[PDB]
Amino acid sequence: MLHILCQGTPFEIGYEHGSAAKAVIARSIDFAVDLIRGKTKKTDEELKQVLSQLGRVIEERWPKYYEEIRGIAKGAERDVSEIVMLNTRTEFAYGLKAARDGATTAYCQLPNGALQGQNWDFFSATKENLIRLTIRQAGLPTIKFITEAGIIGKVGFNSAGVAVNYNALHLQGLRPTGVPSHIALRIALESTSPSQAYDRIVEQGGMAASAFIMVGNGHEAFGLEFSPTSIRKQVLDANGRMVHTNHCLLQHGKNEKELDPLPDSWNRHQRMEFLLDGFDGTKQAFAQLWADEDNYPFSICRAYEEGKSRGATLFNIIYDHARREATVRLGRPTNPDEMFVMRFDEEDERSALNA
C-alpha cells in the first residue's frame, strides 16, 4: 500500500498527498463519477454547481481543510471540485442506495489493554485506491490513517492514542451547510482524547447527513449515530463492549426515518455480539473475529459473489490501545493481500509537541 508522509502547511500537506497519489486519485475520481452517473437524472453541469456549493461551505467553515483540499487538487492536477466530490461522497451522492458501503466495528475494554477494530466493505474496484497517510502538523497529534486516495479523513489513529472507525448509516435528511462525515472524521483524528473529539464534533452545530463514528482510546470510547436532526451517543455495555454495523441501535425520535439497511446488518450485529460472548480476550482471538464467514457471502468478512453480493471486505484494522499500534490487513481477513503494523516514532511525537 502506498504510504505518503505529509508535513508543513495545510497546502503543502495536500500537495504531497495529491502529487504522490496522482494516478490513484485519477482512479478514485473516475470510479466515483461512474458510481453517480449510473444513477442520476441531473447533468454534469448541474452536479458541478452542487460541488461548487459544497466547496464554498468547506472554504468558509473549515479553511485549513479547504487549503489542504486545494493542495491535493494542485498536486494531482485535478479541479478543486473533483477533490471536494471525493471528500463529500455521502452528501453529494445523497439518495443513491446502490452506492452504499458497509462495516462491522467493535470495541472491547480488557484488563491488559482495550482492543478496537473494524472491517470496511465496498466495491472491490476501490481496494486498489486505498492508500495510507502519515500527517504531521506542528502542535497537533500526528495522524496515521487508511483512506481512498484524495480524501482528508477516514479510518485510523493518532499519536495521542485516539482511534477512529466509520460505519455507513442511513437516516433520512441532508443539510448542505452541515459538517460532512469525512470532515468529522478528520476533526476526531486531530483531537487529543475521545472526550475532545465528541466536543469538537458537537461544536460544529449539526451534521450534513447520516453516518456512525466510533472514537476510542485505552480509557474511554463512544459511538455516535447521527443525522442532520439527531446526534446520539453509544456507550460501553455491561460487558465493556460496543458493536456496530449499519443500522440504528439507539433511541432516535420517531420523526427519524431509517432508509432500508440490508437484512445482514442485523445478522452481522447479532453474530459479532455472539462471538464476543465466547471471546477469551487475546489479541490473537480478536483478530480472528474479523475473518468470520457465517452467512457468507454477507458475512462479517464480506465476499464478492456476482448476482448476490456486489461488495467485499476491503480492509481490516485493529487498534492495540495498550501498545499504540494499529494492525492493518488489506483485503479479506480470511486471506489478506498484505498485513502491516502502524506505529508512531519519535519524530511523529516531536511534531505533536511542536519541539
Curated annotation (Swiss-Prot):
Enzyme Commission no: 2.3.1.164
Catalytic activity: isopenicillin N + phenylacetyl-CoA + H2O = penicillin G + L-2-aminoadipate + CoA + H(+)
Biological process terms in GO annotation: penicillin biosynthetic process
Induction text: The transcription factor rfx1 controls penicillin biosynthesis through the regulation of the acvA, ipnA and aatA transcription.
PTM section of the record: The pre-AAT protein is synthesized as 40 kDa precursor which is then self-processed into an 11 kDa (protein A) and a 29 kDa (protein B). The B protein carries AAT activity.
Keywords: Acyltransferase, Antibiotic biosynthesis, Peroxisome, Transferase, Zymogen
Molecular function, one GO term: isopenicillin-N N-acyltransferase activity
Metabolic or biological pathway: Antibiotic biosynthesis; penicillin G biosynthesis; penicillin G from L-alpha-aminoadipate and L-cysteine and L-valine: step 3/3
EC supergroup of this enzyme: transferase
General function of this protein: Isopenicillin-N N-acyltransferase; part of the gene cluster that mediates the biosynthesis of penicillin, the world's most important antibiotic. AatA catalyzes the exchange of the alpha-aminoadipyl side chain of isopenicillin N for phenylacetic acid to yield penicillin. This step occurs in the peroxisomal matrix and the penM and paaT transporters are involved in the isopenicillin N and phenylacetic acid import into the peroxisome, respectively.
Recorded family membership: Belongs to the peptidase C45 family.
Descriptive protein name: Isopenicillin-N N-acyltransferase
Organism: Penicillium chrysogenum
Lineage: Eukaryota, Fungi, Dikarya, Ascomycota, Pezizomycotina
